Amino acid sequence: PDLIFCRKQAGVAIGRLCEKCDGKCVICDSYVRPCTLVRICDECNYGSYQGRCVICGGPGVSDAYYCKECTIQEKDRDGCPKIVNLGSSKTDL
Amino acid sequence: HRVIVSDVQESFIWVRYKRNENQLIIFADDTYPRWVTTASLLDYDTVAGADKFGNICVVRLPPNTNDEVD
Amino acid sequence: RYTIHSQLEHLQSKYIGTGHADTTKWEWLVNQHRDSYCSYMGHFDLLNYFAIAENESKARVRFNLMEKMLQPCGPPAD
Amino acid sequence: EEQKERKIMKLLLKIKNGTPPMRKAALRQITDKAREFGAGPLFNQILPLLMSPTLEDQERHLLVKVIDRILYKLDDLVRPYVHKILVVIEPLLIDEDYYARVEGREIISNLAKAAGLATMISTMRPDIDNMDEYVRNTTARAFAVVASALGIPSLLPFLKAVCKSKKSWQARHTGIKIVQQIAILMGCAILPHLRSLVEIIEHGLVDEQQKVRTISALAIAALAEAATPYGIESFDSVLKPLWKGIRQHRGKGLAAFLKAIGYLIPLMDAEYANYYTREVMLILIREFQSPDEEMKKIVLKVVKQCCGTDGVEANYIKTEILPPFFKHFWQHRMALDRRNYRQLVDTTVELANKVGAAEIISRIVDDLKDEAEQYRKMVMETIEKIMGNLGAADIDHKLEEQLIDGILYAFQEQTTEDSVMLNGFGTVVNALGKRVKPYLPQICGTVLWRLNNKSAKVRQQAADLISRTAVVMKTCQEEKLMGHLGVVLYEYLGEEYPEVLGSILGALKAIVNVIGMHKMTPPIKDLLPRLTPILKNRHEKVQENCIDLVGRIADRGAEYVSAREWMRICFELLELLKAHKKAIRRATVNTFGYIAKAIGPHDVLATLLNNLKVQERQNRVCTTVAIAIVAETCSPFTVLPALMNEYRVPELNVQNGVLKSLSFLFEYIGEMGKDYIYAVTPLLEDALMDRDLVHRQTASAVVQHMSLGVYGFGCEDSLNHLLNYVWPNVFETSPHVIQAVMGALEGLRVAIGPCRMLQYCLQGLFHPARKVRDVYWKIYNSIYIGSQDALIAHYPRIYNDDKNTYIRYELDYIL
Numbered sequence A: 001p002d003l004i005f006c007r008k009q010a011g012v013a014i015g016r017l018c019e020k021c022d023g024k025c026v027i028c029d030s031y032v033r034p035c036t037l038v039r040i041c042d043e044c045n046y047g048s049y050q051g052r053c054v055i056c057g058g059p060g061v062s063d064a065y066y067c068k069e070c071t072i073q074e075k076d077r078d079g080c081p082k083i084v085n086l087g088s089s090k091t092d093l
Numbered sequence B: 001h002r003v004i005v006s007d008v009q010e011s012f013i014w015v016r017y018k019r020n021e022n023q024l025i026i027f028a029d030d031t032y033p034r035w036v037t038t039a040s041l042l043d044y045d046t047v048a049g050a051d052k053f054g055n056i057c058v059v060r061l062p063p064n065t066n067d068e069v070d
Numbered sequence C: 001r002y003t004i005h006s007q008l009e010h011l012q013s014k015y016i017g018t019g020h021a022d023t024t025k026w027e028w029l030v031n032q033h034r035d036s037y038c039s040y041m042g043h044f045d046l047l048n049y050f051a052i053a054e055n056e057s058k059a060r061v062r063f064n065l066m067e068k069m070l071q072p073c074g075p076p077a078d
Numbered sequence D: 001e002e003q004k005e006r007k008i009m010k011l012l013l014k015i016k017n018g019t020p021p022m023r024k025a026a027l028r029q030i031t032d033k034a035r036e037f038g039a040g041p042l043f044n045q046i047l048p049l050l051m052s053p054t055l056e057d058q059e060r061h062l063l064v065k066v067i068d069r070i071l072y073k074l075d076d077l078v079r080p081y082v083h084k085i086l087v088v089i090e091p092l093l094i095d096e097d098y099y100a101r102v103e104g105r106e107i108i109s110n111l112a113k114a115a116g117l118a119t120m121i122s123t124m125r126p127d128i129d130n131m132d133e134y135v136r137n138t139t140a141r142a143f144a145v146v147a148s149a150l151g152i153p154s155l156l157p158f159l160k161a162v163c164k165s166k167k168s169w170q171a172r173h174t175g176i177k178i179v180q181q182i183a184i185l186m187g188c189a190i191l192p193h194l195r196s197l198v199e200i201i202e203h204g205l206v207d208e209q210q211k212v213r214t215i216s217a218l219a220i221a222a223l224a225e226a227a228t229p230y231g232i233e234s235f236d237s238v239l240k241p242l243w244k245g246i247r248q249h250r251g252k253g254l255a256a257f258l259k260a261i262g263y264l265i266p267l268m269d270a271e272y273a274n275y276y277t278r279e280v281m282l283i284l285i286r287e288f289q290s291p292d293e294e295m296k297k298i299v300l301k302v303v304k305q306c307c308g309t310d311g312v313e314a315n316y317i318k319t320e321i322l323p324p325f326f327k328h329f330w331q332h333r334m335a336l337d338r339r340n341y342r343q344l345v346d347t348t349v350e351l352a353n354k355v356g357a358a359e360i361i362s363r364i365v366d367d368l369k370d371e372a373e374q375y376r377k378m379v380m381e382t383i384e385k386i387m388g389n390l391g392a393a394d395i396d397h398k399l400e401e402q403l404i405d406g407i408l409y410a411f412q413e414q415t416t417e418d419s420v421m422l423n424g425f426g427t428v429v430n431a432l433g434k435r436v437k438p439y440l441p442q443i444c445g446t447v448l449w450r451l452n453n454k455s456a457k458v459r460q461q462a463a464d465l466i467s468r469t470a471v472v473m474k475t476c477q478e479e480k481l482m483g484h485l486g487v488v489l490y491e492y493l494g495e496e497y498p499e500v501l502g503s504i505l506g507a508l509k510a511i512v513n514v515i516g517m518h519k520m521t522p523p524i525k526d527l528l529p530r531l532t533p534i535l536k537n538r539h540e541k542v543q544e545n546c547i548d549l550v551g552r553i554a555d556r557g558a559e560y561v562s563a564r565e566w567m568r569i570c571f572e573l574l575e576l577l578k579a580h581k582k583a584i585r586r587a588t589v590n591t592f593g594y595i596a597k598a599i600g601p602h603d604v605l606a607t608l609l610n611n612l613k614v615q616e617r618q619n620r621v622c623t624t625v626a627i628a629i630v631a632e633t634c635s636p637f638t639v640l641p642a643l644m645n646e647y648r649v650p651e652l653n654v655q656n657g658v659l660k661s662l663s664f665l666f667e668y669i670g671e672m673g674k675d676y677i678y679a680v681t682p683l684l685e686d687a688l689m690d691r692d693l694v695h696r697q698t699a700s701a702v703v704q705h706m707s708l709g710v711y712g713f714g715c716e717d718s719l720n721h722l723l724n725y726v727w728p729n730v731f732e733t734s735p736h737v738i739q740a741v742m743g744a745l746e747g748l749r750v751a752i753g754p755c756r757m758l759q760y761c762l763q764g765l766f767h768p769a770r771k772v773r774d775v776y777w778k779i780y781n782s783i784y785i786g787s788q789d790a791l792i793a794h795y796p797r798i799y800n801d802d803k804n805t806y807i808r809y810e811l812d813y814i815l
């Protein structure tokens, strides 16, 4: 898998989720207790990328959250959690 | 005949005085380091302590504790 | 070869104060002293404590702690 | 050589079509070789690829980044090319796309910073009196952009000169348009320079050119809107000519002048607002009576703005504005347009917000019975918004009469169905509340008549009406009519249309939610057997509403059904706990909780543990979820011993299932798991010392979820005991196992403290073995990034050697 996190300084944009992966934690893939709202960086929310899914990239229909365990361990305090595809290009998958 | 001693970097140490053999004997200590500033005895087995960093703690000896060891 | 796990471990090595299997005692202790001084400057009552113990003003203690941050523990070996 | 430099600028193709690493590398290379390449070839290659007609937005963004980075390096070496750059990217300032405009603004800003102010002025000057409006438009926009990039004070003298030019009224027009575009682009950041901008443009209101007068009025309006709410001392020398001009002019120029008046009046204090509003209101009525669409669109906004200021009085409004307003503005041609329709609705709602809901509603109510569907729709929109903002505390009899008559007629005669009438009906009746007792009979008669026939969309609308009105239908001391309509609803349960079925299910749920589970006309004993086969439908609306209804029944009326039927319903719901939709998932979790609470754990858990063994993976997850739900609703005191007896069975592929169940169970129950750590520790001790790697991985998952779930409740003794068994597994070569062990260690950090973790870790940081050192530094780096500041108190004492001082003396100070 050629997938990393963005991990840039996140700003005031809010992450979205498509309807497949809707109630998951963007970090640990859990469904128990969504706690903290996800912020993304300004580059990952731009132009045609505005409003896409943080996890997969599809059309977003709800807000993305950190679960309670990640909030307790302070995993919301790293960079932008958008998934980046290194094996392909920008307008690719 | 019990003595509670505070250390600068360690926590409290418990000491007994044996009158007939003229001895000061350590019989218990703590498992955590503590920069102790002050201490107060609550009863025969319990100490309250404070730290240089802003914490208060209460430490108690287990009931099975043998005061007469070597 | 690009995984999330090797990206996490490389970002850990970028956080100042982190070490590896070739870290020396000197480096470890210099990190300890530097963030000890930063924490004394952050916490207000530890600084009050030191300022009463050594009969100095708080601004003077902060300036001294700042000056000691450039080379704590003396110079390195080699 | 010239033929080679394009071959090297293939770096551009690398940047456009490449992965992130190749893109970053080529970006570095071009930004370090920009000065050697030069501004000639770089832009001679970048501009065609920029104005290519098959470029996409992301490649344009990448090219914008490249242009920024090369303009940073080439600072004045672009002066002989500024004109070419501007010719290429002067469009993209007027494009339809929003991001094209943003990127054009970035390029023009970086270019104006690389070159000077003098170069930009000298290059852009000649196209100011050019006789093509399009060119003048883009030149004004680009001048506004360079002003935003280099500061207004740098461009104030050029504007002061160009707005007073004596040879070209086109040049004067362009300069004032530049000021307007500056206001529009920069917003409230113009306030320190308001007086200077107004002083530059104020001589234009009295120009002998009508085009110049109009652009001056529009610029004054833009500056006022940007400055709102501050800054009115800077508009006086315009306050006098503006009012003289609205009393003198007629036409487009009058429209622009009135727009400026309307933006300026909300800036004033009370006396000034009152006085200037009287004047503008006289001429504003004369324009109330007007043909022009743009004029009326301006006039509505000016009325909305004037009537919203503090100095203007509700009595003056009532006596002067409302009669001609409602006389000339509420007709079918006003209903026919769209933009003007939306402006009129907002103006009327906001007028009500200061004059009282009674005045407006009593003025427009009788039009609810009209021969125009669009007119009825507009009146209903207005009334619904007013009664949603203000309420019905001031409405009285002879007005509720007309209100109810009208909304009933409008619901009945509606031919094309749309949610406007539905939401208006709902808002009106829910705002009345207790006060509509004497009308509920004919209301319910109408709902029943609409529900009995009419193509099933009328039926679905009536079902939604029942849904949103049942609360007031009961809290008004009424149950027989809702019982009867619940009966006729229950008769509508085999349907061809899933969206209508969802609506009737929702209406039934709303009824059973408020009416007693006793005292009810349709019996639950006959309702639920009808509900059970609907659980197999696949439409999402049907599924969610049906499951929610069954959950409400199981919650309030469990004592009317048999545990056998509850068992069947549980086993039919089991597989929906992993459904693809969040709504279905949450509904199923709630319903399973209610049903498990209704019956009990003893026989449900029997079958759950039974099918734990004989099921495959995709079906095992739902069983684990169901076990955790049962343990949460009926205490895990009844779940854990039976679940550990299953582990006692000597079989892999069964012990693994028990372990996965325990992990998800502790994760789901959270702080409730603090009474059950001692009971589970022996199983985990056996599992963490085991030949199978999956055993150890799953047991570490369990430890992690337990330790994070109990945090701040004092189970440090139990978790220290378990840490003793977790630690021996840190020397594990397997990726998933070592990843589980690290997560368990990070959870135990939170639960136990960084002190104990540091005490375990100090053993091998300086071990002779490089492998031990690797592992221990990984663990230490985790403990250090999490809780760096707490470690200041826990470091051990290290002594001074010959050359270096390692003791911390401040901590040895005594007071």
Ligand SMILES: [Zn+2]
Pocket: A025, A026, A027, A028, A029, A030, A066, A067, A068, A069, A070
């Ligand atoms: Zn998480």
Ligand SMILES: [Zn+2]
Pocket: A006, A007, A008, A040, A041, A042, A043, A044, A080, A081, A082
């Ligand atoms: Zn990002």
Ligand SMILES: [Zn+2]
Pocket: A017, A018, A019, A020, A021, A053, A054, A055, A056, A057, A058
């Ligand atoms: Zn997705």
